[PDB]
Amino acid sequence: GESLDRCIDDINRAVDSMSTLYFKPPGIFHNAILQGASNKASIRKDITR
Amino acid sequence: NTIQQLLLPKIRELSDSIITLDSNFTRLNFIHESLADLNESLGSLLYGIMSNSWCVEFSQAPHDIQDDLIAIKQLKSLEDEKNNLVMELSN
Amino acid sequence: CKSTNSILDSWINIHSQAGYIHKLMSDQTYLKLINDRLHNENVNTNDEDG
């Protein structure tokens, strides 16, 4: 019935909102710290950089 | 008729669960943004600290700090021994 | 979350070293010893064993 249509519409809206979510990418300083602590050669490469 | 009715509740709880999951993921996204901001602030502080570290010299940085501290506590204990021994002698 | 954890362990290491060397700087005897060590090196750098 119309309840089925309402449920389908609500699910579609929920999925559409779920797709539109954006998670912030790592910033400028996180990259520096993490790549300078990632690997033994990576620490030297980041110190050089 | 009644059989599509038999189904419809199941899709209804599915809809409820999906809506709850969507809201939970939005809250998790807020938490993720907060974590990113905290990471950026702390990483900036650490980067400044390490840049200054690669730029300054401290002339009395120890090298065997574990040996130094065990030696210090050993000397401390020997000093308590000396103090007990001397105050007994004086007494 | 893993990156945040890594940053926090770096902070933990820094603070642990800070605590150890604060313990070192707490004792006056070691500081006196390194002080007259500096003065001895001023008068004679050779006698490290001293």
PDB file of C-alpha atoms in Angstrom:
ATOM      1  CA  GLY A   1       0.000   0.000   0.000  1.00  0.00           C
ATOM      2  CA  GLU A   2       0.939   3.648   0.434  1.00  0.00           C
ATOM      3  CA  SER A   3       3.026   2.581   3.434  1.00  0.00           C
ATOM      4  CA  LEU A   4       5.234   0.572   1.067  1.00  0.00           C
ATOM      5  CA  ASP A   5       5.679   3.641  -1.137  1.00  0.00           C
ATOM      6  CA  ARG A   6       6.494   5.777   1.907  1.00  0.00           C
ATOM      7  CA  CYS A   7       9.068   3.258   3.137  1.00  0.00           C
ATOM      8  CA  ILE A   8      10.674   3.041  -0.309  1.00  0.00           C
ATOM      9  CA  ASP A   9      10.851   6.835  -0.555  1.00  0.00           C
ATOM     10  CA  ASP A  10      12.366   7.125   2.925  1.00  0.00           C
ATOM     11  CA  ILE A  11      14.964   4.469   2.105  1.00  0.00           C
ATOM     12  CA  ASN A  12      15.834   6.223  -1.157  1.00  0.00           C
ATOM     13  CA  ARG A  13      16.225   9.540   0.672  1.00  0.00           C
ATOM     14  CA  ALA A  14      18.418   7.898   3.306  1.00  0.00           C
ATOM     15  CA  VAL A  15      20.623   6.302   0.643  1.00  0.00           C
ATOM     16  CA  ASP A  16      20.917   9.575  -1.284  1.00  0.00           C
ATOM     17  CA  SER A  17      21.969  11.417   1.870  1.00  0.00           C
ATOM     18  CA  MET A  18      24.386   8.587   2.713  1.00  0.00           C
ATOM     19  CA  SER A  19      26.070   8.885  -0.687  1.00  0.00           C
ATOM     20  CA  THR A  20      26.492  12.668  -0.406  1.00  0.00           C
ATOM     21  CA  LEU A  21      28.550  12.429   2.801  1.00  0.00           C
ATOM     22  CA  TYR A  22      32.095  13.770   2.479  1.00  0.00           C
ATOM     23  CA  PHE A  23      34.838  12.862   4.953  1.00  0.00           C
ATOM     24  CA  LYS A  24      37.558  15.481   5.263  1.00  0.00           C
ATOM     25  CA  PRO A  25      40.886  14.433   3.703  1.00  0.00           C
ATOM     26  CA  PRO A  26      44.014  14.705   5.868  1.00  0.00           C
ATOM     27  CA  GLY A  27      45.501  18.181   6.079  1.00  0.00           C
ATOM     28  CA  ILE A  28      48.914  19.638   5.416  1.00  0.00           C
ATOM     29  CA  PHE A  29      50.652  18.868   8.733  1.00  0.00           C
ATOM     30  CA  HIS A  30      49.285  15.349   9.204  1.00  0.00           C
ATOM     31  CA  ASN A  31      51.009  14.415   5.953  1.00  0.00           C
ATOM     32  CA  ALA A  32      54.328  15.823   7.153  1.00  0.00           C
ATOM     33  CA  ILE A  33      54.213  14.037  10.510  1.00  0.00           C
ATOM     34  CA  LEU A  34      52.886  10.693   9.271  1.00  0.00           C
ATOM     35  CA  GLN A  35      55.191  10.395   6.258  1.00  0.00           C
ATOM     36  CA  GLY A  36      58.111  11.491   8.423  1.00  0.00           C
ATOM     37  CA  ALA A  37      57.270   8.711  10.871  1.00  0.00           C
ATOM     38  CA  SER A  38      56.081   6.093   8.351  1.00  0.00           C
ATOM     39  CA  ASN A  39      59.173   4.098   7.341  1.00  0.00           C
ATOM     40  CA  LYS A  40      62.877   4.155   8.153  1.00  0.00           C
ATOM     41  CA  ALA A  41      63.712   5.462   4.681  1.00  0.00           C
ATOM     42  CA  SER A  42      60.582   7.630   4.799  1.00  0.00           C
ATOM     43  CA  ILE A  43      61.864   9.562   7.826  1.00  0.00           C
ATOM     44  CA  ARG A  44      65.044  10.430   5.915  1.00  0.00           C
ATOM     45  CA  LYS A  45      63.088  11.340   2.779  1.00  0.00           C
ATOM     46  CA  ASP A  46      60.763  13.631   4.738  1.00  0.00           C
ATOM     47  CA  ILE A  47      63.696  15.244   6.557  1.00  0.00           C
ATOM     48  CA  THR A  48      65.245  15.940   3.155  1.00  0.00           C
ATOM     49  CA  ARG A  49      61.933  17.310   1.853  1.00  0.00           C
TER      50      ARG A  49
ATOM     51  CA  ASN B   1      -3.166  -8.668  -0.275  1.00  0.00           C
ATOM     52  CA  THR B   2      -2.492 -10.080   3.182  1.00  0.00           C
ATOM     53  CA  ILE B   3       0.783 -11.519   1.858  1.00  0.00           C
ATOM     54  CA  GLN B   4       2.144  -8.167   0.725  1.00  0.00           C
ATOM     55  CA  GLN B   5       1.022  -7.126   4.212  1.00  0.00           C
ATOM     56  CA  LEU B   6       3.153  -9.966   5.582  1.00  0.00           C
ATOM     57  CA  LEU B   7       6.104  -8.428   3.736  1.00  0.00           C
ATOM     58  CA  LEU B   8       5.484  -4.737   4.415  1.00  0.00           C
ATOM     59  CA  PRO B   9       6.545  -4.776   8.118  1.00  0.00           C
ATOM     60  CA  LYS B  10       9.892  -6.304   7.148  1.00  0.00           C
ATOM     61  CA  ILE B  11      10.606  -3.501   4.676  1.00  0.00           C
ATOM     62  CA  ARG B  12       9.394  -1.114   7.386  1.00  0.00           C
ATOM     63  CA  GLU B  13      11.983  -2.261   9.934  1.00  0.00           C
ATOM     64  CA  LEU B  14      14.523  -2.237   7.108  1.00  0.00           C
ATOM     65  CA  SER B  15      13.653   1.417   6.468  1.00  0.00           C
ATOM     66  CA  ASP B  16      13.953   2.243  10.165  1.00  0.00           C
ATOM     67  CA  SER B  17      17.347   0.537  10.388  1.00  0.00           C
ATOM     68  CA  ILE B  18      18.585   2.296   7.244  1.00  0.00           C
ATOM     69  CA  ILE B  19      17.495   5.712   8.548  1.00  0.00           C
ATOM     70  CA  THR B  20      19.224   5.059  11.874  1.00  0.00           C
ATOM     71  CA  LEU B  21      22.359   3.922  10.038  1.00  0.00           C
ATOM     72  CA  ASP B  22      22.320   7.080   7.913  1.00  0.00           C
ATOM     73  CA  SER B  23      22.065   9.300  10.991  1.00  0.00           C
ATOM     74  CA  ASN B  24      24.843   7.331  12.687  1.00  0.00           C
ATOM     75  CA  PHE B  25      27.085   7.832   9.664  1.00  0.00           C
ATOM     76  CA  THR B  26      26.430  11.583   9.669  1.00  0.00           C
ATOM     77  CA  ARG B  27      27.411  11.694  13.347  1.00  0.00           C
ATOM     78  CA  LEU B  28      30.500   9.631  12.530  1.00  0.00           C
ATOM     79  CA  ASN B  29      31.335  12.159   9.809  1.00  0.00           C
ATOM     80  CA  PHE B  30      31.167  14.957  12.380  1.00  0.00           C
ATOM     81  CA  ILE B  31      33.476  12.941  14.633  1.00  0.00           C
ATOM     82  CA  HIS B  32      35.806  12.389  11.670  1.00  0.00           C
ATOM     83  CA  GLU B  33      36.004  16.125  10.973  1.00  0.00           C
ATOM     84  CA  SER B  34      36.758  16.769  14.651  1.00  0.00           C
ATOM     85  CA  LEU B  35      39.527  14.156  14.566  1.00  0.00           C
ATOM     86  CA  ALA B  36      40.990  15.727  11.426  1.00  0.00           C
ATOM     87  CA  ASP B  37      41.068  19.184  13.018  1.00  0.00           C
ATOM     88  CA  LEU B  38      42.699  17.842  16.188  1.00  0.00           C
ATOM     89  CA  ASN B  39      45.255  15.971  14.086  1.00  0.00           C
ATOM     90  CA  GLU B  40      46.093  19.114  12.145  1.00  0.00           C
ATOM     91  CA  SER B  41      46.571  21.259  15.254  1.00  0.00           C
ATOM     92  CA  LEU B  42      48.695  18.689  17.087  1.00  0.00           C
ATOM     93  CA  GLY B  43      50.690  17.913  13.953  1.00  0.00           C
ATOM     94  CA  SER B  44      51.449  21.588  13.427  1.00  0.00           C
ATOM     95  CA  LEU B  45      52.735  21.852  16.989  1.00  0.00           C
ATOM     96  CA  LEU B  46      54.858  18.705  16.593  1.00  0.00           C
ATOM     97  CA  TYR B  47      56.221  19.896  13.248  1.00  0.00           C
ATOM     98  CA  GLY B  48      57.273  23.219  14.731  1.00  0.00           C
ATOM     99  CA  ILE B  49      58.900  21.436  17.660  1.00  0.00           C
ATOM    100  CA  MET B  50      60.829  19.057  15.396  1.00  0.00           C
ATOM    101  CA  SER B  51      61.876  21.861  13.043  1.00  0.00           C
ATOM    102  CA  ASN B  52      63.330  23.741  16.001  1.00  0.00           C
ATOM    103  CA  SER B  53      64.957  20.515  17.213  1.00  0.00           C
ATOM    104  CA  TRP B  54      66.716  20.132  13.854  1.00  0.00           C
ATOM    105  CA  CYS B  55      67.877  23.746  14.299  1.00  0.00           C
ATOM    106  CA  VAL B  56      69.224  24.082  17.872  1.00  0.00           C
ATOM    107  CA  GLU B  57      71.951  22.377  19.899  1.00  0.00           C
ATOM    108  CA  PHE B  58      71.780  21.393  23.567  1.00  0.00           C
ATOM    109  CA  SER B  59      75.292  20.835  24.885  1.00  0.00           C
ATOM    110  CA  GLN B  60      74.431  18.483  27.781  1.00  0.00           C
ATOM    111  CA  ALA B  61      72.046  15.891  26.380  1.00  0.00           C
ATOM    112  CA  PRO B  62      72.782  12.518  28.056  1.00  0.00           C
ATOM    113  CA  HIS B  63      73.298   9.306  26.078  1.00  0.00           C
ATOM    114  CA  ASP B  64      72.876   6.461  28.585  1.00  0.00           C
ATOM    115  CA  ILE B  65      69.952   8.002  30.471  1.00  0.00           C
ATOM    116  CA  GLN B  66      68.890   4.610  31.850  1.00  0.00           C
ATOM    117  CA  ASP B  67      72.388   4.014  33.217  1.00  0.00           C
ATOM    118  CA  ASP B  68      72.428   7.577  34.538  1.00  0.00           C
ATOM    119  CA  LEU B  69      69.162   7.162  36.448  1.00  0.00           C
ATOM    120  CA  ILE B  70      70.083   3.764  37.891  1.00  0.00           C
ATOM    121  CA  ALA B  71      73.424   5.245  38.964  1.00  0.00           C
ATOM    122  CA  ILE B  72      71.627   8.228  40.505  1.00  0.00           C
ATOM    123  CA  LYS B  73      69.239   6.067  42.522  1.00  0.00           C
ATOM    124  CA  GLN B  74      72.121   3.808  43.575  1.00  0.00           C
ATOM    125  CA  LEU B  75      74.078   6.841  44.794  1.00  0.00           C
ATOM    126  CA  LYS B  76      70.945   8.099  46.556  1.00  0.00           C
ATOM    127  CA  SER B  77      70.634   4.778  48.404  1.00  0.00           C
ATOM    128  CA  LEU B  78      74.330   4.836  49.311  1.00  0.00           C
ATOM    129  CA  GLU B  79      73.757   8.349  50.670  1.00  0.00           C
ATOM    130  CA  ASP B  80      70.936   7.132  52.914  1.00  0.00           C
ATOM    131  CA  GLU B  81      73.340   4.420  54.079  1.00  0.00           C
ATOM    132  CA  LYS B  82      76.005   7.052  54.801  1.00  0.00           C
ATOM    133  CA  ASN B  83      73.509   9.235  56.682  1.00  0.00           C
ATOM    134  CA  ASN B  84      72.253   6.368  58.857  1.00  0.00           C
ATOM    135  CA  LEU B  85      75.795   5.236  59.547  1.00  0.00           C
ATOM    136  CA  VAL B  86      77.019   8.700  60.532  1.00  0.00           C
ATOM    137  CA  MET B  87      74.031   9.535  62.730  1.00  0.00           C
ATOM    138  CA  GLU B  88      74.415   6.207  64.531  1.00  0.00           C
ATOM    139  CA  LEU B  89      78.114   6.981  65.054  1.00  0.00           C
ATOM    140  CA  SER B  90      77.304  10.449  66.390  1.00  0.00           C
ATOM    141  CA  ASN B  91      74.492   9.103  68.579  1.00  0.00           C
TER     142      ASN B  91
ATOM    143  CA  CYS C   1      42.029   7.178  13.812  1.00  0.00           C
ATOM    144  CA  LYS C   2      45.314   5.344  13.235  1.00  0.00           C
ATOM    145  CA  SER C   3      47.087   8.600  12.371  1.00  0.00           C
ATOM    146  CA  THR C   4      45.677  10.245  15.503  1.00  0.00           C
ATOM    147  CA  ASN C   5      46.952   7.307  17.537  1.00  0.00           C
ATOM    148  CA  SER C   6      50.409   7.663  15.980  1.00  0.00           C
ATOM    149  CA  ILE C   7      50.535  11.376  16.813  1.00  0.00           C
ATOM    150  CA  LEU C   8      49.514  10.566  20.375  1.00  0.00           C
ATOM    151  CA  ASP C   9      52.233   7.925  20.789  1.00  0.00           C
ATOM    152  CA  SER C  10      54.772  10.456  19.528  1.00  0.00           C
ATOM    153  CA  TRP C  11      53.536  12.842  22.224  1.00  0.00           C
ATOM    154  CA  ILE C  12      53.780   9.995  24.751  1.00  0.00           C
ATOM    155  CA  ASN C  13      57.416   9.348  23.828  1.00  0.00           C
ATOM    156  CA  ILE C  14      58.270  13.047  24.082  1.00  0.00           C
ATOM    157  CA  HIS C  15      56.656  13.350  27.500  1.00  0.00           C
ATOM    158  CA  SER C  16      58.347  10.179  28.762  1.00  0.00           C
ATOM    159  CA  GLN C  17      61.768  11.540  27.807  1.00  0.00           C
ATOM    160  CA  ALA C  18      60.804  14.838  29.434  1.00  0.00           C
ATOM    161  CA  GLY C  19      59.960  13.032  32.665  1.00  0.00           C
ATOM    162  CA  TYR C  20      63.190  11.028  32.697  1.00  0.00           C
ATOM    163  CA  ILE C  21      65.398  14.055  32.137  1.00  0.00           C
ATOM    164  CA  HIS C  22      63.360  16.032  34.676  1.00  0.00           C
ATOM    165  CA  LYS C  23      64.223  13.289  37.158  1.00  0.00           C
ATOM    166  CA  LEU C  24      67.857  13.727  36.127  1.00  0.00           C
ATOM    167  CA  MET C  25      67.677  17.503  36.650  1.00  0.00           C
ATOM    168  CA  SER C  26      65.974  16.996  40.027  1.00  0.00           C
ATOM    169  CA  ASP C  27      69.111  15.551  41.641  1.00  0.00           C
ATOM    170  CA  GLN C  28      71.598  18.238  42.648  1.00  0.00           C
ATOM    171  CA  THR C  29      74.528  15.803  42.853  1.00  0.00           C
ATOM    172  CA  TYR C  30      74.575  14.970  39.136  1.00  0.00           C
ATOM    173  CA  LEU C  31      74.331  18.645  38.194  1.00  0.00           C
ATOM    174  CA  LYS C  32      77.199  19.501  40.544  1.00  0.00           C
ATOM    175  CA  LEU C  33      79.224  16.648  39.030  1.00  0.00           C
ATOM    176  CA  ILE C  34      78.655  17.829  35.472  1.00  0.00           C
ATOM    177  CA  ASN C  35      79.454  21.388  36.595  1.00  0.00           C
ATOM    178  CA  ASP C  36      82.899  20.596  37.971  1.00  0.00           C
ATOM    179  CA  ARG C  37      83.319  18.288  34.980  1.00  0.00           C
ATOM    180  CA  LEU C  38      82.855  21.368  32.796  1.00  0.00           C
ATOM    181  CA  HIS C  39      85.345  23.311  34.911  1.00  0.00           C
ATOM    182  CA  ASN C  40      87.840  20.427  34.782  1.00  0.00           C
ATOM    183  CA  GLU C  41      87.529  20.268  30.991  1.00  0.00           C
ATOM    184  CA  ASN C  42      88.221  24.003  31.107  1.00  0.00           C
ATOM    185  CA  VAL C  43      91.428  23.342  33.050  1.00  0.00           C
ATOM    186  CA  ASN C  44      92.083  19.911  31.488  1.00  0.00           C
ATOM    187  CA  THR C  45      89.906  18.141  28.921  1.00  0.00           C
ATOM    188  CA  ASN C  46      92.105  15.025  28.914  1.00  0.00           C
ATOM    189  CA  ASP C  47      91.121  13.512  32.270  1.00  0.00           C
ATOM    190  CA  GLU C  48      87.749  12.120  31.207  1.00  0.00           C
ATOM    191  CA  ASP C  49      88.205   9.243  33.671  1.00  0.00           C
ATOM    192  CA  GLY C  50      88.397  11.781  36.501  1.00  0.00           C
TER     193      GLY C  50
END
